[PDB]
């Protein structure tokens, strides 16, 4: 780090050029490693299946155990191999009265990771190559847009950690100053709203249930990785936030909102509706993915003029994956044995306004386009080429001869 | 692709009467995947139904429905005047969208 | 409340090309998978296909998949339709639609059901 | 092939053929068709195209 | 200038997974074989000139 | 005129190899392709197989693909084949051949019927 | 003489996992597949697996695969095992075991029979 | 996979007298890939027998096997006080092992 005297300098992190190149390179380095790993294409004939029963008990309504044939060895044995999935990579009508099917497999070719690489992001900094430079705005109340009135630079941006989340910010930084609430500047409709806390509240998760785990050979030196027998008394994931640091959270960032927005109403309210993948607040610790009905956490409405109580939410969990949203392919995840544990620190929003109406602001979550979650932590950086070369007048000249 | 037949093709009623309808199926839906909806010319049409059971949000308690295997049925406690429509049975979901014939609905 | 509005009617030539818009409002439009339905005088309904405005994926009828295509814009808040090659049986009435929300208790694709359209369009095929 | 109005067309072969509908299942019959210079055939005790 | 007249209709025939062969339907129109067309006294000067 | 021209008679020994070459004259060698054909006293002709030297692809029968090879040259208007492993039943008059014009009417490979061949060459295999 | 060497005796906790090691001498380590097999009270050997410290190639029961892990150290002159997610029924006596040499009249994999096993390890589940 | 059953599950003997032990498979070992097997408590079990019929280096001479197809066999010209133990028969090779019941050799 070394910090300037007297520069003013504007930047424009809506349309800053290194979160272009961040999402391109997020992109390939799954594409790359995925590669090797086995393909699901086999499996995706269709399936006949049941209502699965835990130990010890009569049902489990939970869950769904699926059977299906299956190539073994190589194409001359087949085999009418079992396993169990969960129902949302699990659809059923066409063809027959028993029939079922994979969930993307039809419009996709599905890959599942290979079991001994992790998810887990890491921090990673970002360096100029030769010839360049970064630069900061070490300012704490800095909107995003327009001049910066303080500046450093640097070789390196400090470490920032690839977290895959929809609905909430976890797992980031947090602003130095008060909360700042960040959007597009030229309407006051606005494409998407990033508010970004000063304190970071707490997240636990959990998925009791202790799965065990059954293999399927397809290939002729590779696995399929399957999800069996399950153990334990049954419950669904579920997460737990503090209640009335919560309260003060949501009471502060109104507090700001409404500096924008001086009438007396601000209604938050639960998920916009429409598919899973932004109705439901996603991550992903541990090995599998978690998606979360939210609705109960946005609730409240307010208007103008601690380690107790505890809010808990029902989460579910899926094992196919729309990631990137990417058109025509999916993702597979193996299950991981027994109970999974965790812990994150929320450290913001990705909010959406609707169409506004009489005397009253409709805020809920949205949005949800996987390049505003980068927008959200590079609003500081920028890179800029230095040109070495320049030419004055003086009062000096060379001997001629 | 499957295919639907609506029953009866009229059905004449006042105000004040009972009215019970029924959608059959050439293959088994098993999975409850079913839709009732209602139509007047001139207008967009709308919803009544979905899941075989669940009613859509706004609409009168006067309607409801019931089915099983491949007979699927539509029903209303008391007819009343602004009923006076067409009304439509549909599989939908997983490429195997279809939708009935119709039937209806008039003053007797 | 919640509407779907379409462009206006339409009068084409027969072997031309059709080309139907319709822009909704009361919700956001990124965030909800939308429908394409026709209905041919006294005829049934005819499912073509439905396209998902948050990421673009396309599913047709392969019926009409030589013959149609979709496509949507966040920005717009509308979605277009294209249908190529018309033919006399296409003179018929076309509606957008839209589907209703995903509850975490439902199974995957549930919601597919009609919840809202629009007021339709007239199109016929004639010189 | 039967072209439209007519019960004959010299140039084309109307083609049906065997093919996996569903990604690695499921065979199913299914007809198209090809302009001559890419089929050919001799075989089989009846006739056999390629 | 060349034309090829006859009206062909598409066909799409699903193998594969986000894929799709690409096949040839009914024909339409009146049938003609294509062709092309050059003027004539002109192609006579330029055989004469080479 | 059309003729093809071969190499002198061969006799050669058990287990070795056989080398025939076959000149053409009276049309463009790289425009036609080229066939080989073996008869035995008294017996049938037998396909070896045939080669384009426009291109180089080759098509063997598999009875004799693994010991059968081709290769042209335009530069000479010559073709010229290779046939290892010599046995006693090798010995026979070999022949290479060309095929008529295709004409606008044709089908596919309605043409590679025999148009020209040579003269032949007699091949014994003795010690 | 040959000799493999076991680690002492286990008693771990239900839905835990337990770790075993055999070490060698006498031979050459890292020359000859390995073995381990279980038995219950009174019940059968139950074959598990094979692994080779030449190329570190390993092939289990499909029974096991979910559940068993080796691998071995040629500068140790040991092998290791892991079992994962412990139930009652893994209550036995567990070895580690040797192949004979293969003479080069001998098919592929007639050796694999078990010439020389270790002392035994007994492993009990309980809290 | 295949399973083994052994016979007689008990065979009293006092030394000097012959013994002859029968192992019966659920399926036909074209290969001959046989091995039996010996065991005493408290010490690491011990091979007698690979391949059907040879026998292993250092094991007396008085151990001799024989069989194809299904019925496989082992038998002593004249026990004597230290065969006193149990014997296992086996086929192996090519991911399909399975072991027998044993046969309980001791003094009559």
Same mark, same amino acid.
Request: positive net charge; contains cysteine; hydrophobic residues 30%.
């Given at each position: 780090?070394?910090?300037?005297?007297?520069?003013?300098?504007?930047?424009?992190?809506?349309?800053?050029?290194?979160?272009?190149?961040?999402?391109?390179?997020?992109?390939?380095?799954?594409?790359?490693?995925?590669?090797?790993?086995?393909?699901?294409?086999?499996?995706?004939?269709?399936?006949?299946?049941?209502?699965?029963?835990?130990?010890?008990?009569?049902?489990?309504?939970?869950?769904?155990?699926?059977?299906?044939?299956?190539?073994?060895?190589?194409?001359?044995?087949?085999?009418?191999?079992?396993?169990?999935?969960?129902?949302?990579?699990?659809?059923?009508?066409?063809?027959?009265?028993?029939?079922?099917?994979?969930?993307?497999?039809?419009?996709?070719?599905?890959?599942?990771?290979?079991?001994?690489?992790?998810?887990?992001?890491?921090?990673?900094?970002?360096?100029?190559?030769?010839?360049?430079?970064?630069?900061?705005?070490?300012?704490?109340?800095?909107?995003?847009?327009?001049?910066?009135?303080?500046?450093?630079?640097?070789?390196?941006?400090?470490?920032?950690?690839?977290?895959?989340?929809?609905?909430?910010?976890?797992?980031?930084?947090?602003?130095?100053?008060?909360?700042?609430?960040?959007?597009?500047?030229?309407?006051? *409709?606005?494409?998407?709203?990033?508010?970004?806390?000063?304190?970071?509240?707490?997240?636990?998760?959990?998925?009791?249930?202790?799965?065990?785990?059954?293999?399927?050979?397809?290939?002729?030196?590779?696995?399929?990785?399957?999800?069996?027998?399950?153990?334990?008394?049954?419950?669904?994931?579920?997460?737990?936030?503090?209640?009335?640091? /919560?309260?003060?959270?949501?009471?502060?960032?109104?507090?700001?909102?409404?500096?924008?927005?001086?009438?007396?109403?601000?209604?938050?309210?639960?998920?916009?509706?429409?598919?899973?993948?932004?109705?439901?607040?996603?991550?992903?610790?541990?090995?599998?993915?978690?998606?979360?009905?939210?609705?109960?956490?946005?609730?409240?409405?307010?208007?103008?003029?601690?380690?107790?109580?505890?809010?808990?939410?029902?989460?579910?969990?899926?094992?196919?994956?729309?990631? /990137?949203?990417?058109?025509?392919?999916?993702?597979?995840?193996?299950?991981?044995?027994?109970?999974?544990?965790?812990?994150? *620190?929320?450290?913001?929003?990705?909010?959406?306004?609707?169409?506004?109406?009489?005397?009253?602001?409709?805020?809920?979550?949205?949005?949800?386009?996987?390049?505003?979650? /980068?927008?959200?932590?590079?609003?500081?950086?920028?890179?800029?080429?230095?040109?070495?070369?320049?030419?004055?007048?003086?009062?000096?000249?060379?001997?001629?001869? | 692709?499957?295919?639907?037949?609506?029953?009866?093709?009229?059905?004449?009623?006042?105000?004040?009467?009972?009215?019970?309808?029924?959608?059959?199926?050439?293959?088994?839906?098993?999975?409850?995947?079913?839709?009732?909806?209602?139509?007047?010319?001139?207008?967009?049409?709308?919803?009544?139904?979905?899941?075989?059971?669940?009613?859509?949000?706004?609409?009168?308690?006067?309607?409801?429905?019931?089915?099983?295997?491949?007979?699927?049925?539509?029903?209303?406690?008391?007819?009343?005047?602004?009923?006076?429509?067409?009304?439509?049975?549909?599989?939908?979901?997983?490429?195997?969208?279809?939708?009935?014939?119709?039937?209806?609905?008039?003053?007797? | 409340?919640?509407?779907?509005?379409?462009?206006?009617?339409?009068?084409?030539?027969?072997?031309?090309?059709?080309?139907?818009?319709?822009?909704?409002?009361? $919700?956001?439009? &990124?965030?909800?998978?939308?429908?394409?339905?026709?209905?041919?005088?006294?005829?049934?309904?005819?499912?073509?296909?439905?396209?998902?405005?948050?990421?673009?994926?396309?599913?047709?009828?392969?019926?009409?998949?030589?013959?149609?295509?979709?496509?949507?814009?966040?920005?717009?808040?509308?979605? $277009?339709?294209?249908?190529? &090659?018309?033919?006399?049986?296409?003179?018929?009435?076309? $509606?957008?639609?839209?589907?209703?929300?995903?509850?975490?208790?439902?199974?995957?694709?549930?919601?597919?059901?009609?919840?809202?359209?629009?007021?339709?369009?007239?199109?016929?095929?004639? &010189?």
């Amino acid at each position: 780090e070394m910090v300037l005297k007297n520069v003013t300098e504007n930047f424009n992190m809506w349309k800053n050029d290194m979160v272009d190149q961040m999402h391109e390179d997020v992109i390939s380095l799954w594409d790359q490693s995925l590669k090797p790993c086995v393909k699901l294409t086999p499996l995706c004939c269709t399936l006949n299946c049941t209502n699965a029963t835990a130990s010890n008990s009569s049902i489990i309504e939970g869950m769904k155990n699926c059977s299906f044939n299956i190539t073994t060895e190589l194409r001359c044995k087949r085999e009418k191999k079992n396993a169990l999935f969960y129902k949302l990579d699990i659809v059923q009508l066409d063809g027959n009265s028993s029939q079922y099917r994979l969930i993307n497999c039809d419009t996709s070719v599905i890959t599942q990771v290979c079991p001994k690489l992790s998810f887990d992001p890491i921090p990673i900094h970002y360096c100029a190559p030769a010839g360049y430079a970064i630069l900061k705005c070490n300012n704490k109340t800095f909107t995003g847009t327009g001049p910066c009135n303080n500046v450093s630079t640097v070789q390196c941006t400090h470490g920032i950690k690839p977290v895959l989340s929809t609905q909430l910010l976890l797992n980031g930084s947090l602003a130095e100053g008060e909360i700042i609430i960040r959007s597009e500047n030229i309407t006051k *409709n606005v494409k998407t709203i990033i508010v970004h806390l000063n304190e970071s509240v707490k997240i636990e998760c959990t998925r009791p249930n202790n799965k065990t785990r059954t293999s399927i050979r397809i290939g002729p030196g590779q696995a399929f990785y399957a999800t069996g027998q399950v153990i334990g008394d049954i419950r669904e994931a579920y997460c737990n936030i503090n209640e009335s640091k /919560w309260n003060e959270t949501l009471q502060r960032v109104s507090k700001k909102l409404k500096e924008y927005f001086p009438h007396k109403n601000i209604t938050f309210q639960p998920s916009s509706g429409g598919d899973l993948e932004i109705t439901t607040h996603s991550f992903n610790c541990g090995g599998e993915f978690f998606y979360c009905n939210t609705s109960s956490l946005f609730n409240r409405t307010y208007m103008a003029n601690n380690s107790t109580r505890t809010i808990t939410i029902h989460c579910r969990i899926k094992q196919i994956i729309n990631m /990137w949203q990417e058109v025509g392919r999916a993702m597979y995840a193996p299950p991981i044995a027994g109970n999974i544990t965790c812990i994150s *620190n929320i450290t913001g929003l990705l909010l959406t306004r609707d169409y506004g109406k009489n005397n009253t602001e409709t805020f809920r979550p949205g949005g949800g386009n996987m390049k505003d979650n /980068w927008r959200s932590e590079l609003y500081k950086y920028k890179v800029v080429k230095i040109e070495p070369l320049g030419v004055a007048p003086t009062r000096c000249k060379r001997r001629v001869v | 692709e499957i295919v639907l037949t609506q029953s009866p093709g009229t059905l004449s009623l006042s105000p004040g009467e009972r009215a019970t309808f029924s959608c059959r199926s050439s293959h088994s839906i098993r999975s409850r995947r079913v839709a009732w909806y209602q139509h007047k010319p001139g207008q967009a049409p709308r919803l009544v139904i979905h899941g075989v059971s669940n009613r859509a949000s706004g609409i009168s308690d006067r309607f409801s429905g019931s089915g099983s295997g491949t007979d699927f049925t539509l029903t209303i406690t008391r007819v009343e005047p602004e009923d006076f429509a067409l009304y439509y049975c549909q599989v939908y979901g997983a490429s195997s969208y279809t939708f009935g014939q119709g039937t209806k609905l008039e003053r007797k | 409340q919640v509407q779907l509005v379409q462009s206006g009617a339409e009068v084409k030539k027969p072997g031309a090309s059709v080309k139907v818009s319709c822009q909704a409002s009361g $919700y956001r439009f &990124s965030n909800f998978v939308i429908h394409w339905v026709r209905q041919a005088p006294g005829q049934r309904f005819e499912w073509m296909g439905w396209i998902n405005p948050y990421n673009g994926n396309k599913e047709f009828s392969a019926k009409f998949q030589d013959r149609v295509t979709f496509t949507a814009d966040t920005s717009a808040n509308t979605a $277009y339709m294209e249908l190529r &090659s018309l033919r006399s049986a296409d003179t018929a009435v076309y $509606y957008c639609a839209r589907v209703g929300p995903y509850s975490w208790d439902d199974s995957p694709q549930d919601n597919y059901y009609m919840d809202v359209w629009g007021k339709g369009t007239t199109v016929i095929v004639s &010189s």
